[PDB]
């Protein structure tokens, strides 16, 4: 994702190497720096795609909960839009099946 969207390489630390990094201060500091850079990379990738404005607009048109459209699923948003439409036009909507 960071190679495509951000066009920046990201080193990967295998889980096996981690315990060895605890034997010296510089390696643990590098591990902490790796975590910091990872968090910054997620923040940058989220900002690049405009995830928050897209979610806000989509939930404004569809009329559902922001957390549900952040989770994912087109069907939930379309279902909420159709439920709003049917409720406005004096209709009986289907119940939930399980």
């Amino acid at each position: 994702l960071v190679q495509q969207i951000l066009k920046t390489e990201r080193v990967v630390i295998p889980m096996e190497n981690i315990q060895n990094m605890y034997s010296e201060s510089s390696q643990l500091l590098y591990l902490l720096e790796h975590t910091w850079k990872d968090a910054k990379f997620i923040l940058q990738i989220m900002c690049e795609l405009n995830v928050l404005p897209l979610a806000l607009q989509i939930t404004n048109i569809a009329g559902n909960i922001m957390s549900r459209t952040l989770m994912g699923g087109r069907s939930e948003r379309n279902e909420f839009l159709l439920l709003h439409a049917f409720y406005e036009n004096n209709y009986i909507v289907p119940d939930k099946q399980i």
Binding site: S75, E79, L82, P94, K96, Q97
Partner: protein, 490 residues
Amino acid sequence: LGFSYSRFYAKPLAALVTYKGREILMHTKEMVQKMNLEVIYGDTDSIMINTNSTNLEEVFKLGNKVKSEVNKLYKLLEIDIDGVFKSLLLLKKKKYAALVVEPTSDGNYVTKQELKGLDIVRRDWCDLAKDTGNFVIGQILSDQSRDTIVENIQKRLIEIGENVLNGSVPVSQFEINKALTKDPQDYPDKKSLPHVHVALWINSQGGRKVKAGDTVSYVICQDGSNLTASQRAYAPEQLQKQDNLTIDTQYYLAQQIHPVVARICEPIDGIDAVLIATWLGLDPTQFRVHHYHKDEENDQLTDEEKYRDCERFKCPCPTCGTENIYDNVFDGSGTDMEPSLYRCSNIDCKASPLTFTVQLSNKLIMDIRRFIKKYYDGWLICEEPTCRNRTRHLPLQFSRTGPLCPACMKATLQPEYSDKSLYTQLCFYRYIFDAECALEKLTTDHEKDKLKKQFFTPKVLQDYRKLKNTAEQFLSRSGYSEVNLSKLFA
């Protein structure tokens, strides 16, 4: 609407919508063809157009004309211009590499390389194979004409094969590295794995022992003990310091460079795997043996070509021991039409094989048994030329076409011995003894009656009918040569 677990599920509405979509796609393809233009791909919302034109302005005008006609036909549906390619190669459904074109101001453009579905999983590929693959893909993605690209690729392959046969390739271009996941002794497949064999030799011979996650280098050579190529694996250090052994150029020419070359050069018309094999050396016939039968199922046949791959009937003469080959009813061409069953292939033998009608009718039977068991062995092989994963277990994870390969996660397994091959072999066994249909094939009645009276007495006709029935018994109900129109129409 089309989701089974939705709240507003409606199967009839979804079916109607899909039917209208198929109708619109068919109408669009028909109208483009009626425009006298060829469509190269269509996927459920997309139509790819090969304009056969170099002027970008003319391409844009033609696309806009298509848009105008489509939007005139309908009211709300509107096809759109999305992008143009400068080069392209369709390998199969939903798989291509290309040069996306970005038009600049007034005529010029910018080309960017795009690839999808052209990923290679195995890291077990040598340096020479990767070099040849990158060279051929770089030539293919270039802007030159098809003839120039093909000629350059042919010259490169000829030079590579000549160098490999002569030995100009450095030994470092022969090392093959593979990483282990289990201990060398815990490989059930063991014998067919070269890296497992060499790692086991290293562990049981000297010092440093290989463990899970380690990488081992091996090279294929010629011991002279006529074992399988996988079992013939040695170490590059071992090969360099040993004198009795030499490089096996056949393995590197056939199983190393040819796969990576043919995985890209197969789609091009006029080029096939056998041509590439001939370019690299004296391979062809062994490669057609190595070739696939169902591969050509993308294009009625004549009797000489439907039975081309079928195995001829082989039977030893019970009194002289000489093998006899049967391929059709008669023998030779012209006036000398003696029955193939009249005299055995040995000149000195005076026994008529037809007199041994029983033995033949016995032998045939087991010949049918063998080819049946093969079809029921269930051997599946991966369709990707670089993977070639052979297994008998049918995975429950299916793709849109067939079973999905478990080693290379994006590939479909195909039967190694198809049902159609067995049906054709049974038909060939029926046909090699069918005098009834072999006499009507004669254009004139004179030769037909002459051969009928000279050799084909009612006794010989009854013998040939019995030999036909030997295979007709297997073809009668079994094999679904039957077509039930009751299930076909109702």
